[PDB]
Design a protein around this ligand. Sequence first.
Ligand code: NA
Ligand code: NA
Ligand code: NA
Ligand code: NA
Ligand code: NA
Length: 238
Amino acid sequence: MIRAVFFTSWGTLISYEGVYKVMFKIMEEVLGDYPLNAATLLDEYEKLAREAFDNNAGKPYRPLKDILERVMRKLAEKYGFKYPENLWEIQLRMAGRYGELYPEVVEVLKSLKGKYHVGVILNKDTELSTAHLDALGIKDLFDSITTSEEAGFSKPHPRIFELALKKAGVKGEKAVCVGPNPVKDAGGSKNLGMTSILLDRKGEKREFWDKADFIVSDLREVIKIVDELNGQGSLEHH
Ligand code: NA
Ligand code: NA
Ligand code: NA
Ligand code: NA
Ligand code: NA
């Protein structure tokens, strides 16, 4: 029986275009009138942030605030603008203002919440990652929020998934995990015995479909999958 459904954040709940918007608005605020195109700065920020996250994958948690400070110091030295004071407050304010959910998210979370433990797993940190969900209005729809900062390790290390399962009170076989990353999400959750669901919203990841138990293009399909897994043996499923 599936008793719990876990979701990641980026590309699952919060759209990539929404994440891009937040980061673009941060770059614009940092630059002020400095004569650098903010989209150009954004591309380099994304590259450096991605490189740091990927290097930390599966390792003990590293404070996000320090990562973003190191990235921005590199960018300020590269491009010649003054390093911004209160960078963290800029991050929090822009996360409070910008971003968007995929259009089916609220409906799906509400449909599941009545029948399953609905959890979110966050890899960047606790504070900023939770603040973004709160600003988008979905923080309280979750029965649990579990982060790499709380577990002490980032995906795909097992501890983050172990902690999420403890919050739900079940072993991995009673849970599904939905996310876009075949290694960090599908592989990571399957290591704890969960049923892995790869989210491929654009149908562009076929070469990684073998890394998951199920593939979906939107979150409405998750409800169907869990209902199917739980309808085994009744007269309706038959
Ligand atoms: Na629930
Ligand atoms: Na409940
Ligand atoms: Na935190
Ligand atoms: Na933090
Ligand atoms: Na794992």
